């Protein structure tokens, strides 16, 4: 709410440095794994310095301090830092017991700080504001945001709830609160375009998003809220004796993607990410081959078969204009221009460029990154059918 001037930002730097000092206490014995508070906060400091360096003169700084997202970000960073400091003070010697509730609260705060850092990097890439140019991954989700919010970067939860409810009914106030805790990754009662992108990637397809979220997160005993890689390994340790035990949660290092942890034969805990592949299918195939059998160690494993009818790949119709164009080149529009062999059957999101799945898979398998045609991050894909003009 307050204007984020240079003075207000530096105040956050002090609070953050104190939190870092508190976390550098040898007695904590924090593990060097994401989310790692001793990485996140100095990295947050660096990115805020970068932002200030791009907004150098008086006019730019006044502009920066009036940026809606940035005001909210700075205020959240301030609140969360004070919360962290408060945690150590009241927590006392409980901070040194891993199993305590106070440490769990530190782990939660670390996740939030990690989510915030990834957010400010997406919104202020290279320290310059690009929030109004952010590209939502899923086309239908992108269109929803543009219709109700235009190019806004961030909106109050209450406003977001109303607009979402207009398109996808929220059944109760209780469902709304649960929905808020899932999408509000930074825990600031606002919904950023970045959080909206993560939520819609995780729970696609958009057409039945709230139904998907209910089946995958609300009524599924496998779903773990705000857990880390280490917490998953620790939680599943109780079920080392029962192979097939599995849980899933949001990946911390690859936001918008799922991490599935499972107990193997015999006894070891592994975690995997089905990269940009729908979780429903991954759980179905995992259950079929006897890998994911006991969600959170429980006896019954839910059947998700056909709980997501794929709204059949929207056909793209090669126009006469294009046909003639590729004809003048001795080629066709439909042909994949990477292999020159198969036809285009996948659309890369958010850039929209087309190629075949075989080449996309081969590209990513060879450690290649970004769309071949524009280098934009491949945040999602949609299967498509190109109908030949012939």
């Amino acid at each position: 709410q307050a204007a984020a001037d240079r003075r207000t930002v530096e105040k956050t730097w002090k609070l953050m440095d104190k939190v870092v000092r508190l976390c550098q206490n040898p007695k904590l014995q924090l593990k060097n794994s994401p989310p790692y508070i001793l990485d996140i906060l100095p990295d947050t400091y660096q990115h805020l310095r970068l932002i200030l360096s791009k907004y150098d003169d008086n006019q730019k700084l006044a502009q920066l301090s009036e940026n809606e997202y940035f005001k909210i970000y700075i205020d959240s960073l301030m609140k969360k830092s004070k919360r962290a400091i408060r945690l150590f003070k009241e927590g006392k010697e409980r901070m040194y017991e891993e199993q305590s509730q106070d440490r769990r609260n530190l782990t939660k705060l670390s996740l939030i700080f990690s989510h915030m850092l990834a957010e400010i990097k997406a919104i202020f890439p290279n320290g310059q504001f690009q929030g109004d140019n952010f590209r939502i991954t899923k086309a239908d989700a992108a269109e929803f945001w543009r219709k109700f919010f235009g190019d806004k970067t961030i909106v109050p939860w209450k406003v977001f709830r109303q607009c979402l409810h207009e398109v996808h009914q929220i059944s109760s106030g209780l469902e709304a609160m649960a929905l808020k805790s899932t999408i509000d990754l930074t825990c600031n009662d606002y919904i950023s375009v970045f959080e909206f992108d993560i939520f819609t990637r995780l729970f696609q397809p958009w057409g039945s998003i709230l139904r998907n979220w209910n089946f995958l997160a609300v009524t599924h005993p496998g779903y773990m809220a705000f857990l880390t890689y280490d917490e998953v390994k620790a939680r599943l340790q109780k079920y080392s004796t029962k192979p097939g035990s599995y849980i899933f949660r949001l990946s911390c290092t690859r936001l918008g993607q799922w991490a599935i942890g499972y107990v193997t034969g015999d006894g070891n805990i592994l975690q995997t990410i089905p990269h940009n592949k729908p979780l429903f299918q991954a759980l179905i195939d995992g259950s079929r081959e006897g890998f994911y059998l006991y969600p959170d160690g429980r006896s019954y494993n839910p059947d998700l078969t056909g709980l997501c009818e794929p709204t059949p790949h929207d056909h793209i119709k090669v126009t006469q204009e294009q046909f003639e164009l590729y004809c003048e080149m001795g080629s066709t529009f439909q042909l994949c221009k990477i292999c020159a062999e198969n036809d285009k059957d996948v659309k890369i999101e958010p850039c929209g460029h087309l190629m075949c799945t075989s080449c996309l898979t081969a590209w990513q398998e060879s450690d290649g990154q970004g769309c071949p045609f524009c280098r934009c991050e491949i945040k999602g894909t949609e299967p498509i059918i190109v109908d030949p003009f012939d």
């Binding site: 290092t253 991490a259 592994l270 995997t272 089905p274 991954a282 081959e289 890998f291």
Partner: peptide
């Protein structure tokens, strides 16, 4: 490494 292994198949 990140601690993530290939999908079980």
């Amino acid at each position: 490494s990140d601690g993530y292994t290939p999908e079980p198949a």
